[PDB]
């Protein structure tokens, strides 16, 4: 194989770094123009989302490696911020060429990017120190879910989504805990609904319902019998499923399998519950018996969901039918089979007003692209919202923060006479590329457009108002309500600024060429 060093590597790193910053820059923000992306499979994905673009790209290099990696630490915690962290890393790398071309060693600038990465996140700190409680922040949660639902263009009237993300974060992730819960938030949805068909389910919706509507739709508080046990074909994991191969076998199994389920569905109710959640469902034969034995219960519960309805409800674990006991049961504040407004989306909810250990946002949509349109949008909302419901620290987005940063950055950059005097100043120059590439997408000349904000910063020297991010012509950060959590913007940088510098410290690469990923 081969070892490429210095300028070779220098042209190995920024090269693969430069192009993917470009696909996202015309994808950048709400005006970022979406990208249809098609697999070898005949697939089609219209993506302005970098992480989705990165999920769409298997493209090959340590950069393309780190890129698919870098955004998705921003996309879960903070959500929105996925796009800027990469494109700006390229812009930083875009600079380091000319800046090493000035004869400043890549590690001579390297600290200067991070050194001046301080002022930006430090300047972000200055923007809005506000932190609001759930019931107060819920408007800023949806006011940010104005923006953080905005980029996917599923936002207004989706204040449903915006509000269901308010409680979904609060329900499981506390405000004081500030340990991220996207794991105990259950992201859920189904095709055939509608974007405006939207709900936050507090407990667990199990997809299948009671074996009949001829038995009540409603199981009361708790009494959920947690069951791994066949009332339909078991398909056990220890042996293999086979069915009856003989004529006398359909005779006896029909007669045998009925009276046991008669006994067992009674034995469930003997052990007791108004709901038996079975990993292995009721058959249609066992359905009429759940009717005949006069018990409500769920037929099908997921193999994992038998843990879910156990944990997510806090319901005390009943492993199986043989472990059935009265004191151990799955729990509910109530149990319903809920039509969501489109009977196509129909679930049996085990709902938690007692303890929700998995809170379920249930989105709906005409199809899957539309619910995912909502969900990743709801995600980034739910993300920033959770960030904000932890600490409501916000910042006016669209770069007017960075336009205010870059000036203060490059100034405070010059203060250290060390060669990063200049190098940190060039760092600030990169802070201006995202609203730039946004102003491109906005239909505006970013050059003049930023200088409007520059002038506005010359006016303000912090973002309050700003330029367009959505394309309107009312140029505001505050009144347009272009606002991001103050956290993730700093996290964008922290993710954006070092990877460059980290790639700066690693130019020594054994490769025949870039494509090794």
């Amino acid at each position: 194989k081969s070892r490429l060093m210095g300028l070779e590597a220098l042209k190995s790193h920024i090269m693969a770094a430069k192009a993917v910053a470009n696909t996202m820059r015309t994808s950048l923000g709400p005006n970022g123009l979406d990208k249809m992306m098609v697999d070898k499979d005949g697939d089609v994905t219209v993506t302005n989302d970098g992480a989705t673009i990165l999920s769409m790209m298997d493209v090959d290099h340590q950069i393309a490696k780190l890129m698919v990696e870098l955004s998705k630490s921003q996309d879960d915690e903070i959500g929105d911020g996925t796009t800027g962290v990469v494109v700006l890393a390229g812009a930083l790398l875009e600079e380091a060429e000319q800046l090493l071309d000035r004869g400043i060693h890549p590690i001579r600038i390297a600290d200067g990017y991070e050194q001046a990465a301080r002022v930006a996140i430090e300047h972000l700190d200055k923007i809005s120190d506000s932190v609001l409680v759930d019931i107060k922040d819920t408007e800023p949660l949806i006011q940010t879910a104005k923006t953080t639902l905005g980029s996917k263009v599923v936002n207004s009237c989706h204040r449903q989504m915006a509000e269901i993300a308010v409680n979904a974060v609060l329900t499981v992730a506390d405000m004081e805990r500030r340990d991220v819960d996207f794991e105990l938030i259950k992201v859920e949805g189904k095709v055939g609904g509608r974007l405006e068909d939207t709900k936050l389910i507090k407990g667990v919706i199990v997809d299948k319902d009671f074996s009949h509507p001829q038995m009540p739709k409603k199981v009361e508080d708790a009494k959920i019998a947690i069951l791994t046990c066949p009332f339909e074909p078991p398909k056990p994991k220890t042996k293999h499923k086979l069915d009856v191969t003989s004529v006398e076998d359909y005779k006896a199994l029909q007669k045998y399998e009925k009276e046991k389920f008669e006994e067992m569905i009674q034995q469930i109710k003997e052990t007791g519950a108004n709901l038996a959640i079975c990993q292995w469902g009721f058959d249609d034969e066992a359905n009429h018996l759940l009717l005949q034995n006069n018990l409500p219960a769920v037929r099908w519960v997921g193999g994992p969901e038998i843990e879910l309805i156990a944990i997510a409800t806090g319901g005390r674990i009943v492993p199986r039918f043989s472990e059935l006991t009265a004191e151990k049961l799955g729990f509910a504040g109530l149990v319903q089979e809920i039509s969501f407004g489109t009977t196509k989306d129909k679930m049996l909810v085990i709902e938690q007003c007692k303890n929700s250990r998995a809170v379920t946002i249930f989105i709906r949509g005409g199809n899957k692209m539309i619910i995912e349109e909502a969900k990743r949008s709801l995600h980034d909302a739910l993300c920033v919202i959770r960030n904000l419901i932890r600490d409501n620290r916000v910042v006016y987005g669209g770069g007017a923060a960075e336009i205010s940063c870059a000036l203060a950055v490059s100034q405070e950059a010059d203060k250290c006479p060390t060669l990063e005097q200049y190098a940190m100043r060039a760092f600030a120059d990169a802070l201006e590329v995202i609203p730039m590439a946004l102003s491109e997408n906005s239909g505006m000349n970013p050059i003049q457009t930023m200088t409007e904000v520059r002038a506005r910063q010359v006016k303000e020297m912090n973002p309050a108002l700003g330029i367009d991010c959505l394309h309107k012509g009312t140029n505001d950060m505050k009144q347009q309500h272009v606002i991001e959590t103050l956290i993730g913007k700093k996290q964008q940088i922290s993710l954006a600024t070092q990877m460059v510098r980290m790639i700066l410290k690693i130019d020594d690469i054994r490769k025949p060429g870039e494509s090794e990923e």
Binding site: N31, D34, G42, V44, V247, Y250, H471
Partner: protein, 508 residues
């Protein structure tokens, strides 16, 4: 992954719908030209296609941008009807419009609202010359009739047009508040009739009577059966395998002939002379069922008695085991109607009721296929003509009016995007242009004059590009429900601005 940057992406955005649009813009518009599908990737074939999808889907759509419209234009056709050829050309028009504005170095975003807002005010100007024709039922008749004949047009239909413009409106004038595809029962076969079709009293069914069965059934009370017998009747004992060797292989066929006989026990219990079921029986079975003396009709159609039960006032049900799980159907006759050489067992309980059977007799399926869609398309445009009885002047006259207004608008309306609105307005008059030379006529004057001419208020007077002449859109009958035209405006305007805003395409 293959990264497609904007240079070819916008270009590929343009080529996809244009390269198919040119094919359908022949078919679409008035008729000076069509698509003759010359078919070989799959075969040796020669085909004549006015259908967009038959042009679209048969040919390779593999362009990711062509994927959009071939997917999106079909739905528009699958929704309101005749949207394949429409959403394709009209966005392909915009692709040309974008291309210049692209080549003019203009933000696609700047082009978005420029078209997208222009889409509205055109749909608004579309709503202007949209003229409600619901006045009387005779108006609503001839509205639907003009509209039914509107979608059927620019397509090859032999005897279809004049009969369904009766039927489609007949299906409308019975349901009153919608049209009936739930009622019209399309029955296709080889009758030797060219396109010739008719409203079928009751519903005919295709079987040869023979063996011992007398062919005609009189005073027939049908016993509705949702479950018949295939060959062996299915129940507890219904299956056996005795085969230990090659003799039994020939001897197992003989064992199941017994199972045909026990089927008689079930039907002889019900007692009704006429037993009509879903599942067919064969001629050697006909020996056992016909010698039983009761008349057991095989393959009696669900939608057929669904016709009856609606019109006869009775109940067609599901899950038939014993006679009363479905309310007994009442027909006047179970008869054999002989059409040419055909022998068709024909159930007549009612005539031309609010559920009709429609017998489509043709020697070719493709025409019967494209006849169904244009019928499937018209009734939808007729069912929305039940809702919106505005029939907006078609044949490009709508394009003109919208092109004139939006141009007038772009003049004042933006300070910049007057680029795209007129560009939008330009794409409007496009569809008119391609077909006038197809009559030999000069579109330029037309789109210049007759637009401004009828956008100065001749709006009824409009484009006959079959004759290449200026004629009245209402009197020529060239016009259609305000929805479908706006509906074919909705997707195509949306279809273009998607790949327009697409500046990169990943390819795995």
């Amino acid at each position: 992954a293959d990264e497609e940057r904007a240079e070819t992406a916008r270009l590929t955005s343009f080529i996809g719908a244009i390269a198919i649009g040119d094919l359908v813009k022949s078919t679409l518009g008035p008729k000076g030209m069509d698509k003759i599908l010359l078919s070989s990737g799959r075969d040796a074939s020669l085909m004549v296609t006015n259908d967009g999808a038959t042009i679209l889907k048969n040919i390779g759509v593999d362009n990711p941008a062509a994927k959009v419209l071939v997917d999106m234009s079909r739905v528009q056709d699958d929704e309101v009807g005749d949207g394949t050829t429409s959403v394709t050309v009209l966005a392909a028009e915009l692709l040309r419009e974008a291309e210049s504005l692209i080549a003019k170095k203009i933000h696609p975003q700047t082009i978005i609202a420029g078209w997208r807002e222009a889409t509205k005010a055109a749909r608004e100007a579309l709503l202007s010359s949209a003229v409600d024709h619901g006045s009387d039922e005779v108006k609503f008749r001839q509205d639907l009739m003009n509209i039914a004949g509107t979608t059927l047009s620019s397509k090859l239909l032999t005897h279809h047009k004049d009969h369904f413009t009766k039927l489609a409106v007949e299906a409308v004038l019975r349901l009153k508040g919608s049209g009936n595809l739930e009622a019209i029962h399309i029955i296709k076969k080889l009758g030797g009739s060219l396109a010739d079709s008719y409203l079928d009293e009751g519903f005919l069914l295709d079987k040869k009577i023979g063996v011992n069965q007398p062919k005609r059934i009189e005073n027939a009370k049908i016993l509705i059966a949702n479950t018949g017998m295939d060959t062996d009747k299915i129940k507890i004992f219904g299956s056996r395998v005795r085969v230990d060797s090659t003799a039994k292989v020939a001897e197992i066929e003989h064992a199941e002939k017994e199972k045909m006989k026990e089927k008689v026990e079930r039907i002889l219990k019900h007692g009704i002379n006429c037993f009509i079921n879903r599942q067919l029986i064969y001629n050697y079975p006909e020996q056992l069922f016909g010698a039983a003396g009761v008349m057991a009709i095989e393959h009696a159609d669900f939608a057929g008695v669904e016709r009856l039960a609606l019109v006869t006032g009775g109940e067609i049900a599901s899950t038939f085991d014993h006679p009363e799980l479905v309310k007994l159907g009442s027909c006047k006759l179970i008869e054999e109607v002989m059409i040419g050489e055909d022998k068709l067992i024909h159930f007549s309980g009612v005539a031309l009721g609010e559920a009709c059977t429609i017998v489509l007799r043709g020697a070719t399926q493709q025409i019967l296929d494209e006849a169904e869609r244009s019928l499937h398309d018209a009734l939808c445009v007729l069912a929305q003509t039940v809702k919106d009885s505005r029939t907006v002047y078609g044949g490009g006259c709508s394009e003109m009016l919208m092109a004139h207004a939006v141009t007038q608008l772009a003049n004042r309306t933006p300070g910049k995007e007057a680029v795209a609105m007129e560009s939008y307005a330009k794409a409007l008059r496009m569809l008119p242009t391609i077909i006038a030379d197809n009559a030999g006529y000069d579109s330029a004057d037309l789109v210049a004059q007759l637009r401004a001419a009828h956008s100065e208020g001749n709006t009824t007077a409009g484009l006959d590009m079959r004759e290449g002449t200026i004629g009245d859109m209402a009197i020529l009958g060239i016009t259609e429900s305000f929805q479908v035209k706006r509906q074919v405006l909705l997707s195509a305007a949306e279809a273009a601005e998607v790949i327009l805003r697409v500046d990169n395409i990943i390819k795995a």
